[PDB]
Amino acid sequence: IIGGEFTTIENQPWFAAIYRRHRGGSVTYVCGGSLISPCWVISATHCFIDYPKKEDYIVYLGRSRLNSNTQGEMKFEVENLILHKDYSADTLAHHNDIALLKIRSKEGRCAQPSRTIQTIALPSMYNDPQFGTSCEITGFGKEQSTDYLYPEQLKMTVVKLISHRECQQPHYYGSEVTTKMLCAADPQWKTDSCQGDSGGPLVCSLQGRMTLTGIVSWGRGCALKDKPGVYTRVSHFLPWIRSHT
Numbered sequence: 001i002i003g004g005e006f007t008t009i010e011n012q013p014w015f016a017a018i019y020r021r022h023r024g025g026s027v028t029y030v031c032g033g034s035l036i037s038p039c040w041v042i043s044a045t046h047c048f049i050d051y052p053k054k055e056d057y058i059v060y061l062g063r064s065r066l067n068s069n070t071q072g073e074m075k076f077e078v079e080n081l082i083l084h085k086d087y088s089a090d091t092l093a094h095h096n097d098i099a100l101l102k103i104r105s106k107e108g109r110c111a112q113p114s115r116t117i118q119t120i121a122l123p124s125m126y127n128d129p130q131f132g133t134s135c136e137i138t139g140f141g142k143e144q145s146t147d148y149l150y151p152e153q154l155k156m157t158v159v160k161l162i163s164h165r166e167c168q169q170p171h172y173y174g175s176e177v178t179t180k181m182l183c184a185a186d187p188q189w190k191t192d193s194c195q196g197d198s199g200g201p202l203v204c205s206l207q208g209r210m211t212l213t214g215i216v217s218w219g220r221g222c223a224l225k226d227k228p229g230v231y232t233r234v235s236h237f238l239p240w241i242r243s244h245t
């Protein structure tokens with residue numbers, strides 16, 4: 001997250017932190033996700049496509065810090081890793097950038113909700129907020145494009161939804177952006193998602209309810225003028241989500 005503010009998991013208790021084992025046993029951060037039911041985390045396919053083996057991954061819920069344990073956190077193995085069959089990689093733009101992880105502990109259990117661990121509602125079909133609506137993004141991604149490190153403390157920021165029409169102008173992303181993607185950005189291009197925030201939530205208030213509107217997918221640079229963040233448009237994937245869960 002470029003700009004924005006530090007936060008803790010209590011403020012975004014559906015946030016999932018996804019890591020990968022090595023290869024010698026070191027464990028490194030991969031991507032964010034969102035808890036949509038006790039046993040299911042939703043994320044982005046591009047996070048896992050290079051290492052598509054479920055046994056390599058560890059999922060934490062209730063975690064506020066990158067490399068230290070947060071009190072009350074839960075740790076899971078991935079019982080099931082479901083990548084979207086129609087995924088494709090353009091140079092920048094990933095299509096159908098969506099994935100499901102069925103989570104299960106050593107003890108064979110799913111997430112127990114708590115103050116630090118809650119589910120997030122999916123939107124009703126094809127129902128998104130109007131452009132200019134303020135939504136929030138959360139992640140452990142880079143604080144600056146040039147950074148080598150990820151922040152140790154979770155961050156969040158606010159971005160505004162951009163219309164299909166505005167985002168498809170060539171000055172922005174041209175044809176790279178489809179109707180199954182959503183754009184969002186700061187009017188000053190001052191704050192944004194970045195590398196390491198992939199798979200995490202774009203949450204908007206809909207019908208007076210916090211709703212998973214988007215999943216961090218791609219962008220050119222981070223917090224670059226005329227280059228919004230691009231998000232998987234969750235309201236266009238409900239049949240896929242329902243079927244595979």
Ligand SMILES: N=C(N)NC(=O)c1nc(-c2cncnc2)c(N2CCCCCC2)nc1N
Binds near residue numbers: 197229
């Ligand atoms: N909103 C945004 N402007 N950007 C992003 O959300 C985003 N940006 C980047 C990126 C953009 N430019 C420079 N470095 C990283 C990125 N990469 C891309 C390189 C390899 C794959 C994963 C890491 N992933 C993102 N999800």
